[PDB]
Amino acid sequence: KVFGRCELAAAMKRHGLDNYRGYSLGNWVCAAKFESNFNTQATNRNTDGSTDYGILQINSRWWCNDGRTPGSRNLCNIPCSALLSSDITASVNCAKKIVSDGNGMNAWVAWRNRCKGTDVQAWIRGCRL
Template sequence: MRSMLIVFLFSYFFARYDAKVFSQCELAKKLKAQGLDNFHSYSLANWVCMAKHESKFNTSALNTKNSDGTIDYGIFQVNNKWWCKDNKRSSKNGCNIACSKLLDDDIDDDITCIKRIVKDPNKMNAWNAWVKHCKGKDLSKYLAGCKL
């Protein structure tokens, strides 16, 4: 158990070293290039808004305060109960990815994962911050000035 904790902490701090905080427009361009504009009928602004309110565009964001004891990882706050594996709890690992991979500055695998998540029946309702801050709102400010 102790060795697992040491490995987790080492991988966590190593991943944080490779972290990146995107600018709003930089993330919008990346998401557009990866085909998220109108992916499953969600505009690009929805994805940018979600990332803003989930992580403030920080790839190393880690939320350990979920009431059910689960942890959310990375820029899109992917949950370890359903979508990634972190050796802290059993997981469905629907994205077939180690949670630590969601903490580095390469978000290509994160994007692949959120594309899988939005195909689930909950769609973007899987992200509480999206429901609270983005759903049904004017999101034009999230792409304003981005020159997409």
Template structure:
């Protein structure tokens, strides 16, 4: 039925997920940032949020992570539910929009800390010390 196609197209338009190459273009300036490749960033974003800019998840410790990089409200952003050091000086809800500029700025701050990308458990588990070349394949970056 024709309405199924319309519903599908509306869903695509409302989707908050970025494509891998679309994200690669946005993150291009991070290639080599603090020793991490563009592929590291793509792999991390995939395993953290499946490239979903509106991702929000509650963690085992009761904290909440927000956005494409799953930035945690315990340290990095502030929300109405819990006190935070808010090291990124950003509202957690701002990390849920399709404009990921503030997410990138905050993620760069996180990477500057001693843990680096190990701050993201999913990156450490799925991406660290692996051949990640497939993440940028065909993306023209």
């Protein structure tokens, strides 16, 4: 599913991401925009052989099992394919573990390079939340 901006904002809000660990909703919408263009089916392969899955491009080296990343952990305890669903629940739940891990949202390179320090509230402007 390709979400609309306000549609995703409302779904993330319902799943408890607004101000989760201090990060306002606009941060999470901005990250999803630049990681996946709001497309739950997005995948991208990395040079190390791991793959990034779903709306928040969660990586198979640490967070999910895709059966082809030797020596990876599966800290969210899920198949990576479950992250590609039009229901964002599994993605959100796994993102909550990632962002509690110590370096916060810097774990998402696109957030660090394109969202951090910007006016992120613009990503939820206009939405009925």
